Amino acid sequence: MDIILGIRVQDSVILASSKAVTRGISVLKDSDDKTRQLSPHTLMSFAGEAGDTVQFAEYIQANIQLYSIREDYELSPQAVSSFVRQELAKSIRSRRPYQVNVLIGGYDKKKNKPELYQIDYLGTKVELPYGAHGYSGFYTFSLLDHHYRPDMTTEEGLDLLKLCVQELEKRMPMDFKGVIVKIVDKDGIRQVDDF
Amino acid sequence: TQQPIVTGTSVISMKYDNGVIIAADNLGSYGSLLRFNGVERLIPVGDNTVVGISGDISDMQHIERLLKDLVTENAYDNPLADAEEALEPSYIFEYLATVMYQRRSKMNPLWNAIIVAGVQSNGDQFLRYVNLLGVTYSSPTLATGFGAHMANPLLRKVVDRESDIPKTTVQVAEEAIVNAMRVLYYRDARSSRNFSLAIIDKNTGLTFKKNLQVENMKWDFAKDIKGYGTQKI
Amino acid sequence: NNYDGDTVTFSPTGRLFQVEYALEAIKQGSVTVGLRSNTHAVLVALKRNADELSSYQKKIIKCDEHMGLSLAGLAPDARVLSNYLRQQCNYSSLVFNRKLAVERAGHLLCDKAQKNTQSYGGRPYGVGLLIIGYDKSGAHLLEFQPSGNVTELYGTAIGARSQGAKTYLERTLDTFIKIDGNPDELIKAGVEAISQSLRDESLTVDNLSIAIVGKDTPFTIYDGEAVAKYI
Amino acid sequence: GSRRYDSRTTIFSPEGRLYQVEYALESISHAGTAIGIMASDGIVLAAERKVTSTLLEQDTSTEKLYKLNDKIAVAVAGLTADAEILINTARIHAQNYLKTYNEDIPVEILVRRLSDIKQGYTQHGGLRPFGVSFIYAGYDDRYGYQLYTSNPSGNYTGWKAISVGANTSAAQTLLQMDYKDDMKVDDAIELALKTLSKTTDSSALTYDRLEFATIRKGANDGEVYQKIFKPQEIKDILVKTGIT
Amino acid sequence: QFNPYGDNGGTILGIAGEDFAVLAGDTRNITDYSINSRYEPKVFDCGDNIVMSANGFAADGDALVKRFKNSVKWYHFDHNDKKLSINSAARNIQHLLYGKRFFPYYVHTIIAGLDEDGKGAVYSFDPVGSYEREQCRAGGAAASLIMPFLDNQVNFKNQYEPGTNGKVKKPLKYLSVEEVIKLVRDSFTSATERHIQVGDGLEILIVTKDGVRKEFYELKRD
Amino acid sequence: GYDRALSIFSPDGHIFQVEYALEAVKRGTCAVGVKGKNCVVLGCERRSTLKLQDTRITPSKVSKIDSHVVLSFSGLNADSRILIEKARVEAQSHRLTLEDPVTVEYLTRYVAGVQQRYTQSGGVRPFGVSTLIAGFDPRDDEPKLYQTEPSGIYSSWSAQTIGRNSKTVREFLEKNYDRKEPPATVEECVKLTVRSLLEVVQTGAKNIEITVVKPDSDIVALSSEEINQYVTQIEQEKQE
Amino acid sequence: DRGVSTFSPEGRLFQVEYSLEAIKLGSTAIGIATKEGVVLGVEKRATSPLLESDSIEKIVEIDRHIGCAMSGLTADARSMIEHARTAAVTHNLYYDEDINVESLTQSVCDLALRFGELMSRPFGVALLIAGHDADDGYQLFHAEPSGTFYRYNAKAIGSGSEGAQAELLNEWHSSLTLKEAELLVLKILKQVMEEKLDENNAQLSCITKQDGFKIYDNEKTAELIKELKEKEAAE
Amino acid sequence: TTTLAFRFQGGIIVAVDSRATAGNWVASQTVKKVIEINPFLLGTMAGGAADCQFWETWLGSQCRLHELREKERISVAAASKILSNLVYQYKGAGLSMGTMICGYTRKEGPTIYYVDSDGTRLKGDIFCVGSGQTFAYGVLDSNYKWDLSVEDALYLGKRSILAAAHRNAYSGGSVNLYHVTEDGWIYHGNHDVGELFWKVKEEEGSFNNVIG
Ligand SMILES: *[C@@H](O)[C@H](CC(C)C)NC(=O)[C@H](CC(C)C)NC(=O)[C@H](CC(C)C)NC(=O)OCc1ccccc1
Numbered sequence A: 001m002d003i004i005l006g007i008r009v010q011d012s013v014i015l016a017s018s019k020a021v022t023r024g025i026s027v028l029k030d031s032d033d034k035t036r037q038l039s040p041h042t043l044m045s046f047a048g049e050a051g052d053t054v055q056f057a058e059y060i061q062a063n064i065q066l067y068s069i070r071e072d073y074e075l076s077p078q079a080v081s082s083f084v085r086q087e088l089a090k091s092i093r094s095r096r097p098y099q100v101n102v103l104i105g106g107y108d109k110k111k112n113k114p115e116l117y118q119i120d121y122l123g124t125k126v127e128l129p130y131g132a133h134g135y136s137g138f139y140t141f142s143l144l145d146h147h148y149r150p151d152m153t154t155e156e157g158l159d160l161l162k163l164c165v166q167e168l169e170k171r172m173p174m175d176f177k178g179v180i181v182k183i184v185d186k187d188g189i190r191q192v193d194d195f
Numbered sequence B: 001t002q003q004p005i006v007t008g009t010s011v012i013s014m015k016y017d018n019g020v021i022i023a024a025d026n027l028g029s030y031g032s033l034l035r036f037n038g039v040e041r042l043i044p045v046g047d048n049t050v051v052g053i054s055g056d057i058s059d060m061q062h063i064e065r066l067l068k069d070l071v072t073e074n075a076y077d078n079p080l081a082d083a084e085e086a087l088e089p090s091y092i093f094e095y096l097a098t099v100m101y102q103r104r105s106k107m108n109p110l111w112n113a114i115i116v117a118g119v120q121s122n123g124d125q126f127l128r129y130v131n132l133l134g135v136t137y138s139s140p141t142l143a144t145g146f147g148a149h150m151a152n153p154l155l156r157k158v159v160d161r162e163s164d165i166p167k168t169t170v171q172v173a174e175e176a177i178v179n180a181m182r183v184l185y186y187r188d189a190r191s192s193r194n195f196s197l198a199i200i201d202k203n204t205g206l207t208f209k210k211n212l213q214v215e216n217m218k219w220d221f222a223k224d225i226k227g228y229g230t231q232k233i
Numbered sequence C: 001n002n003y004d005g006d007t008v009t010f011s012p013t014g015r016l017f018q019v020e021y022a023l024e025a026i027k028q029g030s031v032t033v034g035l036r037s038n039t040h041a042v043l044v045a046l047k048r049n050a051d052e053l054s055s056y057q058k059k060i061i062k063c064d065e066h067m068g069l070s071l072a073g074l075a076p077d078a079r080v081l082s083n084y085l086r087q088q089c090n091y092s093s094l095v096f097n098r099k100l101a102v103e104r105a106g107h108l109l110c111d112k113a114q115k116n117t118q119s120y121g122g123r124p125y126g127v128g129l130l131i132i133g134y135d136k137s138g139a140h141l142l143e144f145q146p147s148g149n150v151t152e153l154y155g156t157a158i159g160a161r162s163q164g165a166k167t168y169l170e171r172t173l174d175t176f177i178k179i180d181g182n183p184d185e186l187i188k189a190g191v192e193a194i195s196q197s198l199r200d201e202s203l204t205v206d207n208l209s210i211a212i213v214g215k216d217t218p219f220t221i222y223d224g225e226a227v228a229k230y231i
Numbered sequence D: 001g002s003r004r005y006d007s008r009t010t011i012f013s014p015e016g017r018l019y020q021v022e023y024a025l026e027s028i029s030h031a032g033t034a035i036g037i038m039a040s041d042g043i044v045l046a047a048e049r050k051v052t053s054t055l056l057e058q059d060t061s062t063e064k065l066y067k068l069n070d071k072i073a074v075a076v077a078g079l080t081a082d083a084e085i086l087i088n089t090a091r092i093h094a095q096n097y098l099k100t101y102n103e104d105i106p107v108e109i110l111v112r113r114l115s116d117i118k119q120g121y122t123q124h125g126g127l128r129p130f131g132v133s134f135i136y137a138g139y140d141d142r143y144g145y146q147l148y149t150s151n152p153s154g155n156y157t158g159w160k161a162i163s164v165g166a167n168t169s170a171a172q173t174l175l176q177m178d179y180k181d182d183m184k185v186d187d188a189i190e191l192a193l194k195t196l197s198k199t200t201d202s203s204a205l206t207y208d209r210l211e212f213a214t215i216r217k218g219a220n221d222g223e224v225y226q227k228i229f230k231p232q233e234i235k236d237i238l239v240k241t242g243i244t
Numbered sequence E: 001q002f003n004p005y006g007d008n009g010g011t012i013l014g015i016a017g018e019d020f021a022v023l024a025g026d027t028r029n030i031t032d033y034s035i036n037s038r039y040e041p042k043v044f045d046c047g048d049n050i051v052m053s054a055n056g057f058a059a060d061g062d063a064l065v066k067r068f069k070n071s072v073k074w075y076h077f078d079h080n081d082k083k084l085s086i087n088s089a090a091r092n093i094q095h096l097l098y099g100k101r102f103f104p105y106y107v108h109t110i111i112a113g114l115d116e117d118g119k120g121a122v123y124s125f126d127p128v129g130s131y132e133r134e135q136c137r138a139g140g141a142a143a144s145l146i147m148p149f150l151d152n153q154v155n156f157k158n159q160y161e162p163g164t165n166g167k168v169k170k171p172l173k174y175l176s177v178e179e180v181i182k183l184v185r186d187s188f189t190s191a192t193e194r195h196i197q198v199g200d201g202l203e204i205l206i207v208t209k210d211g212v213r214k215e216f217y218e219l220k221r222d
Numbered sequence F: 001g002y003d004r005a006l007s008i009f010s011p012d013g014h015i016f017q018v019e020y021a022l023e024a025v026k027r028g029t030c031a032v033g034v035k036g037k038n039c040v041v042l043g044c045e046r047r048s049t050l051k052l053q054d055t056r057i058t059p060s061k062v063s064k065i066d067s068h069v070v071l072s073f074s075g076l077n078a079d080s081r082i083l084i085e086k087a088r089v090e091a092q093s094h095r096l097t098l099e100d101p102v103t104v105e106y107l108t109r110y111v112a113g114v115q116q117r118y119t120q121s122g123g124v125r126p127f128g129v130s131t132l133i134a135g136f137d138p139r140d141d142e143p144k145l146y147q148t149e150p151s152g153i154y155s156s157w158s159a160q161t162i163g164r165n166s167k168t169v170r171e172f173l174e175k176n177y178d179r180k181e182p183p184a185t186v187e188e189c190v191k192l193t194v195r196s197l198l199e200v201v202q203t204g205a206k207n208i209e210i211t212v213v214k215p216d217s218d219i220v221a222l223s224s225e226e227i228n229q230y231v232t233q234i235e236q237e238k239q240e
Numbered sequence G: 001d002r003g004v005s006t007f008s009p010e011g012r013l014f015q016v017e018y019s020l021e022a023i024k025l026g027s028t029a030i031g032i033a034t035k036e037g038v039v040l041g042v043e044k045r046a047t048s049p050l051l052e053s054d055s056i057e058k059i060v061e062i063d064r065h066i067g068c069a070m071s072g073l074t075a076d077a078r079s080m081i082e083h084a085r086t087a088a089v090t091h092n093l094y095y096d097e098d099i100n101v102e103s104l105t106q107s108v109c110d111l112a113l114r115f116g117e118l119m120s121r122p123f124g125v126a127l128l129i130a131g132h133d134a135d136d137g138y139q140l141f142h143a144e145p146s147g148t149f150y151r152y153n154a155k156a157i158g159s160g161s162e163g164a165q166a167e168l169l170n171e172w173h174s175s176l177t178l179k180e181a182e183l184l185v186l187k188i189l190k191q192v193m194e195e196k197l198d199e200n201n202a203q204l205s206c207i208t209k210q211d212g213f214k215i216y217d218n219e220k221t222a223e224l225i226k227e228l229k230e231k232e233a234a235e
Numbered sequence H: 001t002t003t004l005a006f007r008f009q010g011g012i013i014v015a016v017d018s019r020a021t022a023g024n025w026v027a028s029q030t031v032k033k034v035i036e037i038n039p040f041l042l043g044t045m046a047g048g049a050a051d052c053q054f055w056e057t058w059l060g061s062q063c064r065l066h067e068l069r070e071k072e073r074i075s076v077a078a079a080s081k082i083l084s085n086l087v088y089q090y091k092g093a094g095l096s097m098g099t100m101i102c103g104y105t106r107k108e109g110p111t112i113y114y115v116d117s118d119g120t121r122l123k124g125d126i127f128c129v130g131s132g133q134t135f136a137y138g139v140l141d142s143n144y145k146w147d148l149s150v151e152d153a154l155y156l157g158k159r160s161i162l163a164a165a166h167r168n169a170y171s172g173g174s175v176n177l178y179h180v181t182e183d184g185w186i187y188h189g190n191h192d193v194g195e196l197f198w199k200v201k202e203e204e205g206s207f208n209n210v211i212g
């Protein structure tokens, strides 16, 4: 289970993603960044089958970067999420579907609002205040149902996120080797180097 | 991929001093039903080759047409079609062997086992086997199906190796083949009494014998057999 | 004139000019001779150089162990046609375990060249070939023209000044046909035949190219000091 | 063979011009004049129907002004049949974009796509180009109100006011004279009709010889409305501006 | 359901000498518990002083050999009658095998000859094309019986010099052609005793600078 | 499909369709490229026959292929969009597979390869476009300026011009540009580029476009007023 | 109009003959083969002084043991080079060896006549393909758009070809050293070039068994030019 | 199979075993699981022998074509990604590959990429791949330090393979060592386990589980 979490607060979106890469019986790496920057104000985290995850993320990244150059303009998070959903919805009826689940965290510069989209490998899109893929949601959703507000600050969002990770580290069976946390706001994307 | 429906059983053959002999019964079985009683499974090609075929009969008839078409095609723009550039057993076999291995590689085989018997231009005896898998081999004696298990042992007592071929006459070889056919009628539950036999000699040419029967059978001892163990009466 | 723009157009007298222009390319090519006896078949070819620094263009191509040809005209077209022969000789061996008959090899070349003369877009082959070979009916010599016409002959010559060698062979017909079991004498007759087509230049060690096939002789090509014996 | 009969539609002249594009532009110069004027609070599209008849059913007729989506419209100059092929392609492209990104297509992107299609017919395929020139009138939230034009060459450019079809030289001079940047829709309506009234080859400009449309933010609050004018509404605006 | 593969038995053996190389194989061909032929050649002279055998499913083996012989023919046509080196042949055979990676030639392939320095060479392949140059290799049905014997008697494995007691190994003295053929004959005689698919006859192809020579020996026919 | 050979040789060994494509480039508005010591500047002509234009939305002459490379052109405008699109796609494709942005030489070689392909492909005519491709290689501070043309040949230039009256501005650059000491600063490079265009342009109002590209993806387009200041300074020095 | 694959009344392909005229307009390229190596040299011919001459790439590596010089419509050569490089590397992959120079040349020449109504016209560029292999040693080939290739001891192509070839006729012998060949290419290039020969408007290269294919530095060529001037002034 | 590669102060150490099996049958003890792609690139082989051999020699052909076209060497990142993109096309077809693409360039420095037939491509400092990876990890992980000497690092890699050759039934034969620096790779010999085991046991005083 490749833990990926997301929380949308007052003025930003925060994505947390596990660092472990386990192939069989061995943890091959404990510092893996399961995310790609699609545009300056849009970040996508991902989790699923080996190989497919990165291949899909980089493919989406390339397409959005192509759009940005062509139009000299950044697509809204809503527009990027719809593009991603269609690719997955197309993929599910292919010969060999992309087995990838994603969270898209973005800051809409037009509306001055943070936005978090949860999309599974079938192409099921939902906009949420907080989201998760895989088994993480079984612990974190109910926990966030209790501790979330729409008017929370970024610092309160991080404390709330620490609470989620602590619960996961307590009750989940795999060692996912901690998480890499990234914040998406009006100033762009930045990584929290100490978590 | 398929399953064979109407089938032909053993084809047996052997080399002798001046040529080759080949034989096969005239039955087309439909499972345990002995459905068709007049099927010719030896198919001559020219006056120097006989192809004996076992297995699926529909596929046999297809192969029969390929060989008939092969003769037609070889005659095209060929003034020496009845002489130097006539079809050889080696040519006919390699053609079939190519087809059989191609068809197995497409996972759509011709469900057969084939023996090409004949005599070459230089008088050399030709005898080679090929089946649905494209597997090929040659031997002084060759047999398919039940014949492999029962006929080969009997024919190998006559020609056990290559050096025994010049020592083997046509009368001795035909005697061995006819005996083997009787043994198969005793023991193969999908055999018939009626069969065809072909001789290809380097001197006397192609002799094709039809409507042969298994004869001189031993059954009289059956009367003395009573019960399955303790039964006196 | 108005009827030579493409190969798909007959002239008012029923001529195909593009085919005739392709035939012209052969006449510009260097001379090559073919002849045979009952036991052997020989190709002799005068190779042509661009200048003194250049090599002498190869004229003879091997098709199988028992067959090969010499060319005159567009060399790339000879490569295409010889490649086709190699494949056809090879198909015959792999499928039928049978060496391809020289006569049937000629028929296949004829039909391949013909398709290019009746269809729009394409063009005729611009090369003439002399095919020799030894098969089940003995020695053979063929002459291929890109019109499609293939002809079996005792001896012949194609290329520039080929009429001289062709006349010599027409006189010598009764002599060289009898040269059985003697390869060197049959080549001598071929070298003497091609000599009738020479002007100014003579046969040197890197100029001459000979090939032979026979009863117990695979198709082999002789060049360089290997033909000094025959000069 | 077939080469004999090939016109070779996609070649350069010795001067470096595309023959068929140039001749297609000549065709368009005889088509009914179409004018587009962009204002601060909207866009006007005006166009002249070509020598009509009294027995033409006008209220159900459409030869000049077409709707591409709710935000974008086009004025046509040239072969109507050719224009409808491209219009239906443009309508599909807009819907493809909407399905993909869940946002209405930006005007320029739609214009570029149609212009790229036209370009293709001049470079490859051996087919004749589309004998059509478009005036695109549209709105999006990036650039706001926009006017573009495309021609058979596949080249497109943006405009404040522009004319296509017949008498563009005369029409462009009149627009260049009376146009100002702080202009409004009601004023632009008047300018468009006055320009057609002077450049027309007809004796007098009447309601039955016109197609008219406006793209206004004059819709209840922050949104855009397309108004394809009816015959009676064109008749009223002709009286209002003082032409009839 | 149709099974496109079969097992024709047989066993092959390649040994490389200092200036020679041998490729041996029994002449028996079988299906299940029956004998098809007591003499069906399995090792072939492929031209350019290269010998080859493809052991396992005979239909696939014959096809592969046939294709490689064809490859040699076209190598001469395409590259001015250049001699195909043993290392170049091996690489070519890899591509023939891997080309059918997803519907494999069901064979163990071995080729033998001389390298470009004139030394004896043996190359061994798996069914899907992985190859390796070796001094010694047995393939086929009785390969598990023969290879350990060759590790012991060719490469002197687990053998040491008396008196030293495990400290000093047996030196790797080269083997002559006469000494190698003895090991080959004993290898097949032993394999014939304990493996039912091995027997009838043994055909050895020896490769030297002078060419390709053949030797035939009888094996038990039970 | 339409397979007709449009680009073919003539008796004198010329491909007229390729040569007529160059005539289309000769007709196009003038474009100029000048590289300094630590920058490259792309100047472009805007013909003032077209007023009442909307300069916000009108397609700009200089196009970004990636964040570190730009492309300007002279010739058919519609044709240029096709090359620009292909170039942009290849730029992202290169980043995706090589994990490194294109070099300026590589991007040029690709665009030139596309142009060449259209000179010996059936059913197509050559591009009536010559391009100037400029930028900086990743993690490199050496300026790059390349030119391409319809035939498909490409080469690097210290300074170059293409389009109408390019013969005149090339004459200017050949005497004014020194290789041993190129324009050391951005100001000097822009000034030399504006000067070269002023030989041909007519009025220095909205007819000159300037785009400065610096190392590490630093690309900016100058405004009307900024360019007008260069135009003012050049002529005031000239009055002497 | 008329077919692209049409024969003339003399028995020549119009388009092939016309492409040969385009090659005559091209810049000069010279190749000389010796027992110590093969030398390749070209005229760069920059159209303007602002053009950075080092970007002119008319000599090109195909493999470590094969080099190539071009003359004519040089844009057409790019696909020919790409094919040659692929053919050389592919053969190494299939056969674990270097590919024969002749076989490489033959592969390139197979593209030549693949035109019709495949590509729309023949190539407008000639190639000098130089290399080394173990069988036939140091070799030099001239590959035309006709599909024909000749081997040469020495060869010149381009605008000054017939004048250069006549000069190569007299100067070449079988005992030439590599140094002697280098100077000889420079000598003949200087003779047929319009502009004065220097290290910036002319380029040298060679192929040896030991070091493989090498394009010469402008500093290295400059010395050979200076060495040439002195030896001509020596008598 | 046991293969490893790790980054350290003096560049990269690559160490592999030499065994090849077919079930319980030991098919070869002398196989080369390191492929010399170019003077600065190495590839490791684990999983399907043919798959690894074929596609990594193919990779070398693609890397050579790169430096012909671009007149510059291929990056380790680009080389590894060519292979990973290739196997991703074949995903589901049944390829079995576990590889490390190890090398050095100026702009990257010493770099190791783990490439997998599942499509996984990972950059990292330490990797152990094959049926014996766990055994090598145990020794390597417990004794690894960034500041080992080229001599101590070579030994650690060699020792880690030995550990795995011992305990893993499908690993063994011999140890092939490589060292990669600024100036390319350097072979450090074939080391038979039959002699190395006893040598290490005596000198190091380890392997007390064994009767010696
Ligand atoms: C260890 O990973 C090692 C690395 C190789 C580079 C040698 N791999 C193996 O030992 C491997 C077993 C793995 C998958 C557990 N063995 C093979 O790949 C094996 C090698 C030959 C030389 C014995 N080949 C094999 O098993 O053949 C595949 C096959 C079998 C039957 C039919 C078709 C294909």
Ligand SMILES: [Mg+2]
Binding pocket: A118, A119, A120, A124, A125, A126
């Ligand atoms: Mg979901």
Ligand SMILES: [Mg+2]
Binding pocket: E192, E193, E195, E196, E197, E198, E199, E200, E220, E221, E222
């Ligand atoms: Mg036995």
